[PDB]
């Protein structure tokens, strides 16, 4: 009872993972290669969030 | 738990002037603490971009050993030892020889 | 290989010994011949590479008991 990702146990996890990957991670990669500052923690946060949604998609079958 | 925390009024035990007392600013993983105004060293700062462009001999605090640091008691103005005794999973710190919760 | 297929006789290993007792490594081979045995229950011929002692065992015990032992051992024929 040390981490709280019970918030995204709803349906449309495929839509949420699609918004996490489709142009969010992509635009952060384009921004990081063109040069902007804040992306250093945002890239890690987005790839971790993609890992959360993909674990939950493997966990449940209703979404 | 750690006896000396992030913001503790503490007193030095050994080295240079051991009478001075100050507040911890950082606790390092190497078993060392930065206490405010205690190990003033004069670093010869080279010129560099971003911050510290001209450089200087500006004093800076060095890390001192947390064993060389003892906590301070306001009621009895001496160095004191710390114990961890309370009933639940959150153990409070108490002063030895006074039995008062910090 | 040179295996009797009914008595399990393989080449064993011993010595050529002479008058001066010079030991030289030699091997003793089984008296192996390929023989077609007529089986009456299956009404056919079964070819086995067997020793002459193996054919004596086949004559004594019958070919049906022998082939039952070969199926029990799992050996093809």
């Amino acid at each position: 009872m040390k981490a709280k990702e019970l918030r995204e146990k709803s349906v449309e996890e495929l839509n949420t993972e699609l918004l996490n990957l489709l142009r969010e991670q992509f635009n952060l990669r384009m921004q990081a290669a063109s040069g902007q500052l804040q992306q250093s923690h945002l890239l890690k946060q987005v790839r971790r969030d993609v890992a959360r949604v993909k674990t939950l998609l493997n966990e449940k079958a209703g979404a | 738990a750690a006896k000396i925390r992030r913001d503790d009024e503490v007193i030095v035990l050994t080295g240079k002037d051991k009478g001075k007392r100050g507040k911890v600013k950082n606790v390092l993983s190497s078993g060392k603490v930065i206490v405010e105004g205690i190990n003033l060293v004069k670093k010869h700062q080279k010129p560099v971009p971003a911050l510290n462009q001209p450089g200087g001999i500006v004093e800076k605090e060095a890390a001192i050993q947390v064993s060389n640091v003892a906590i301070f008691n306001a009621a009895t103005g001496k160095a004191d030892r710390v114990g961890f005794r309370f009933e639940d999973g959150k153990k409070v710190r108490f002063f030895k020889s006074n039995s008062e919760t910090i | 290989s040179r295996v009797c297929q009914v008595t399990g006789k393989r080449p064993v290993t011993g010595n050529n010994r002479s008058h001066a007792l010079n030991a030289t490594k030699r091997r003793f081979l089984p008296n192996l011949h390929s023989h077609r045995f007529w089986v009456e229950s299956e009404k056919r011929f079964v070819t086995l590479r067997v020793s002459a002692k193996g054919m004596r065992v086949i004559d004594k015990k019958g070919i049906d008991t022998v082939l039952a032992e070969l199926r029990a051992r799992g050996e093809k024929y």
Binding site: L21, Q25, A33, S34 | - | -
Partner: protein, 93 residues
């Protein structure tokens, strides 16, 4: 059925940003760093989907990594794939 939006992570960096790439954008092509295992159909679909532009032909090459370090610690940089993506027409921005 244009390829999966998960699979359209092949585009890695927008612009290699030197005189060859900028001269190719001045005349004809965008130059991109596109994955290692990306095929030309994947790069074509990814450019046409993730950008508004239309592409005619994609030319790819594999860049080998260099060593760049002294003999105390010899190491190698990673191989990467460089795509010349031809979309010379119909953009003002």
């Amino acid at each position: 059925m244009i390829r999966e939006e998960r699979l359209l992570k092949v585009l890695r960096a927008p612009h290699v940003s030197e005189k060859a790439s900028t001269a190719m954008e001045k005349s004809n092509t965008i130059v991109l760093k596109v994955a290692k295992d990306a095929t030309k159909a994947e790069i074509k679909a990814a450019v046409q989907k993730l950008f508004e532009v239309e592409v005619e032909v994609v030319n790819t090459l594999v860049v080998k990594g260099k060593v760049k370090r002294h003999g105390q610690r010899i190491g190698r940089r990673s191989d990467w794939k460089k795509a010349y993506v031809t979309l010379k027409e119909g953009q003002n921005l």
